């Protein structure tokens, strides 16, 4: 069988190592799990959904920021929307920067704010390239199979 084919070994390799270097979190797992009516693209739809939500709310809070004065109000509000949306799919380097603004939001301290959104963005567009990745080996997998 084709089980331990490079394409086989290569996707529980690099899902194996996003779980280990902590992109991901068991709420993914969850996601991914065999179940008797959804398919794989059950959580490739979710994160889909997940990419465009978060997409948004990243320029929403790059343009807050830049706003004078800043509503430090807002990013919260901001932040915390992101960490359930994190927490949803068990992006987990994602939700748990998403944590760390509350404390400079109630401070009114911009430069913390800015730092906090730079690791924020970052680790976002890790994850997503690092789940693309995921998604295309399980798509070219797919296509060995038919069929």
């Given at each position: 069988s084709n089980a331990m084919d490079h394409l086989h070994r290569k996707l529980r390799d690099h899902e194996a190592a996003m779980f280990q270097q902590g992109y991901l979190d068991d709420q993914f797992s969850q996601l991914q799990k065999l179940q008797?009516?959804?398919?794989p693209d059950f959580v490739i739809e979710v994160m889909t959904m997940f990419f465009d939500d978060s997409e948004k709310l990243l320029n929403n809070m790059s343009r807050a920021l830049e706003q004078?004065?800043?509503n430090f109000k807002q990013i919260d509000a901001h932040a915390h929307q992101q960490k359930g949306s994190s927490a949803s799919v068990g992006a987990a380097r994602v939700k748990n920067v998403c944590g760390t603004f509350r404390n400079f939001c109630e401070a009114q301290n911009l430069e913390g704010c800015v730092r906090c959104l730079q690791q924020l963005q970052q680790e976002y567009s890790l994850l997503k390239n690092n789940l693309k990745y995921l998604f295309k080996l399980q798509q070219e997998i797919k296509t060995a199979g038919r069929s």
């Open positions: 008797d009516d959804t398919s004078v004065p800043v």
